[PDB]
Design an enzyme around this catalytic site. Structure first.
Site, PDB file in Angstrom:
ATOM      1  N   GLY A  29       0.906  -1.116   0.069  1.00  0.00           N
ATOM      2  CA  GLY A  29      -0.010  -0.161   0.011  1.00  0.00           C
ATOM      3  C   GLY A  29       0.914   1.303  -0.037  1.00  0.00           C
ATOM      4  O   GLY A  29       1.741   1.296  -0.850  1.00  0.00           O
ATOM      5  N   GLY A  31       3.626   4.140   1.024  1.00  0.00           N
ATOM      6  CA  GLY A  31       4.929   4.186   1.535  1.00  0.00           C
ATOM      7  C   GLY A  31       6.038   3.484   0.615  1.00  0.00           C
ATOM      8  O   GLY A  31       5.516   3.190  -0.350  1.00  0.00           O
ATOM      9  N   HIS A  47       5.897  -6.501  -6.174  1.00  0.00           N
ATOM     10  CA  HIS A  47       5.035  -5.355  -6.863  1.00  0.00           C
ATOM     11  C   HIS A  47       5.930  -4.180  -6.842  1.00  0.00           C
ATOM     12  O   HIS A  47       5.510  -3.524  -8.149  1.00  0.00           O
ATOM     13  CB  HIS A  47       3.781  -5.503  -6.158  1.00  0.00           C
ATOM     14  CG  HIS A  47       2.956  -4.542  -6.825  1.00  0.00           C
ATOM     15  ND1 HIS A  47       2.201  -3.445  -6.268  1.00  0.00           N
ATOM     16  CD2 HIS A  47       2.298  -4.818  -8.151  1.00  0.00           C
ATOM     17  CE1 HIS A  47       1.322  -2.798  -7.363  1.00  0.00           C
ATOM     18  NE2 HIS A  47       1.325  -3.711  -8.446  1.00  0.00           N
ATOM     19  N   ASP A  89       0.606  -5.507 -11.694  1.00  0.00           N
ATOM     20  CA  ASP A  89      -0.576  -5.751 -11.017  1.00  0.00           C
ATOM     21  C   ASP A  89      -1.307  -7.127 -10.681  1.00  0.00           C
ATOM     22  O   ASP A  89      -1.838  -7.562  -9.588  1.00  0.00           O
ATOM     23  CB  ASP A  89      -1.800  -4.845 -11.356  1.00  0.00           C
ATOM     24  CG  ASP A  89      -1.451  -3.430 -11.137  1.00  0.00           C
ATOM     25  OD1 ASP A  89      -0.512  -3.169 -10.564  1.00  0.00           O
ATOM     26  OD2 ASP A  89      -1.921  -2.289 -11.610  1.00  0.00           O
TER      27      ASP A  89
END
Length: 121
Positions: A29, A31, A47, A89
Protein backbone atom coordinates in the site's frame (compact mmCIF):
# COMPACT_ATOMS: atom_id res chain seq x y z
CA UNK A 1 -4.32 2.49 -12.66
CA UNK A 2 -5.03 2.18 -8.95
CA UNK A 3 -8.71 1.29 -9.65
CA UNK A 4 -7.61 -1.70 -11.75
CA UNK A 5 -5.05 -2.84 -9.13
CA UNK A 6 -7.66 -2.59 -6.41
CA UNK A 7 -10.27 -4.41 -8.46
CA UNK A 8 -7.86 -7.30 -9.19
CA UNK A 9 -7.02 -7.64 -5.49
CA UNK A 10 -10.74 -7.75 -4.60
CA UNK A 11 -11.35 -10.23 -7.44
CA UNK A 12 -8.48 -12.53 -6.46
CA UNK A 13 -8.41 -12.30 -2.67
CA UNK A 14 -12.00 -11.40 -1.79
CA UNK A 15 -10.87 -8.41 0.32
CA UNK A 16 -11.16 -4.68 -0.16
CA UNK A 17 -7.66 -3.55 -1.03
CA UNK A 18 -7.71 -0.17 0.73
CA UNK A 19 -8.51 -1.39 4.32
CA UNK A 20 -6.88 -4.83 3.98
CA UNK A 21 -3.63 -4.04 2.15
CA UNK A 22 -3.26 -0.23 2.05
CA UNK A 23 -1.09 -0.10 5.20
CA UNK A 24 -0.10 -3.72 5.58
CA UNK A 25 3.43 -4.68 6.67
CA UNK A 26 6.54 -2.91 5.37
CA UNK A 27 5.62 -2.88 1.66
CA UNK A 28 1.90 -3.11 0.98
CA UNK A 29 0.00 0.00 0.00
CA UNK A 30 1.28 3.44 0.95
CA UNK A 31 4.98 4.22 1.55
CA UNK A 32 8.25 2.68 0.31
CA UNK A 33 9.61 -0.84 0.41
CA UNK A 34 11.13 -2.38 3.53
CA UNK A 35 12.31 -5.77 4.64
CA UNK A 36 9.14 -7.91 4.41
CA UNK A 37 7.27 -8.97 7.56
CA UNK A 38 5.88 -12.13 5.88
CA UNK A 39 4.70 -13.69 2.63
CA UNK A 40 1.78 -11.30 2.06
CA UNK A 41 4.22 -8.41 2.54
CA UNK A 42 6.67 -10.04 0.11
CA UNK A 43 4.08 -9.96 -2.68
CA UNK A 44 4.02 -6.21 -2.16
CA UNK A 45 7.86 -5.86 -2.17
CA UNK A 46 8.03 -7.58 -5.54
CA UNK A 47 5.14 -5.50 -6.87
CA UNK A 48 6.87 -2.17 -5.96
CA UNK A 49 10.06 -3.48 -7.57
CA UNK A 50 7.97 -4.43 -10.63
CA UNK A 51 6.72 -0.84 -10.86
CA UNK A 52 10.33 0.30 -11.18
CA UNK A 53 10.22 -0.88 -14.84
CA UNK A 54 7.48 1.65 -15.71
CA UNK A 55 9.60 4.27 -17.47
CA UNK A 56 6.83 5.97 -19.44
CA UNK A 57 3.58 5.36 -17.53
CA UNK A 58 2.06 5.96 -14.12
CA UNK A 59 0.72 2.89 -12.25
CA UNK A 60 -1.45 5.23 -10.24
CA UNK A 61 -3.32 7.14 -12.97
CA UNK A 62 -2.82 5.38 -16.31
CA UNK A 63 -5.58 2.98 -17.19
CA UNK A 64 -4.88 -0.31 -18.94
CA UNK A 65 -7.37 -2.84 -20.23
CA UNK A 66 -7.73 -6.34 -18.83
CA UNK A 67 -10.42 -8.98 -18.57
CA UNK A 68 -11.53 -11.10 -15.64
CA UNK A 69 -12.59 -14.49 -17.10
CA UNK A 70 -13.86 -17.48 -15.16
CA UNK A 71 -11.80 -16.53 -12.09
CA UNK A 72 -8.87 -15.65 -14.41
CA UNK A 73 -7.04 -12.40 -15.13
CA UNK A 74 -5.98 -11.68 -18.73
CA UNK A 75 -4.14 -8.40 -19.56
CA UNK A 76 -5.57 -6.92 -22.74
CA UNK A 77 -4.45 -4.97 -25.78
CA UNK A 78 -2.18 -2.28 -24.28
CA UNK A 79 0.92 -0.32 -25.22
CA UNK A 80 4.17 -1.85 -23.93
CA UNK A 81 4.43 0.23 -20.75
CA UNK A 82 0.80 -0.54 -19.81
CA UNK A 83 1.37 -4.21 -20.60
CA UNK A 84 4.12 -4.28 -17.96
CA UNK A 85 1.96 -2.41 -15.49
CA UNK A 86 -1.01 -4.77 -15.86
CA UNK A 87 1.24 -7.80 -15.48
CA UNK A 88 2.72 -6.26 -12.29
CA UNK A 89 -0.77 -5.80 -10.81
CA UNK A 90 -1.85 -9.27 -11.95
CA UNK A 91 1.10 -10.94 -10.25
CA UNK A 92 0.48 -9.08 -6.95
CA UNK A 93 -3.24 -9.97 -6.90
CA UNK A 94 -2.42 -13.66 -7.55
CA UNK A 95 0.43 -13.57 -5.01
CA UNK A 96 -1.67 -11.98 -2.23
CA UNK A 97 -4.43 -14.54 -2.92
CA UNK A 98 -1.87 -17.34 -2.78
CA UNK A 99 -0.67 -16.77 0.96
CA UNK A 100 -4.12 -16.11 2.49
CA UNK A 101 -3.66 -18.72 5.13
CA UNK A 102 -0.70 -16.55 6.36
CA UNK A 103 -2.20 -13.02 6.17
CA UNK A 104 -1.64 -11.38 9.55
CA UNK A 105 -4.35 -9.01 10.84
CA UNK A 106 -1.66 -7.74 13.24
CA UNK A 107 0.21 -6.41 10.25
CA UNK A 108 -2.88 -4.84 8.68
CA UNK A 109 -1.97 -1.38 9.87
CA UNK A 110 1.83 -1.33 10.16
CA UNK A 111 4.19 1.30 11.70
CA UNK A 112 6.03 1.49 8.38
CA UNK A 113 8.71 4.05 9.47
CA UNK A 114 10.17 1.46 11.89
CA UNK A 115 10.76 -1.05 9.08
CA UNK A 116 14.18 -2.42 8.20
CA UNK A 117 15.46 -0.71 5.03
CA UNK A 118 14.58 -2.60 1.84
CA UNK A 119 17.09 -4.60 -0.14
CA UNK A 120 17.91 -3.58 -3.68
CA UNK A 121 15.41 -4.55 -6.35
Amino acid sequence: NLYQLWKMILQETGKNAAPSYGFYGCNCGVGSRGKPKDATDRCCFVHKCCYKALTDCSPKTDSYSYSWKDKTIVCGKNNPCLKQECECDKAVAICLRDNLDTYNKNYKIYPKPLCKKADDC
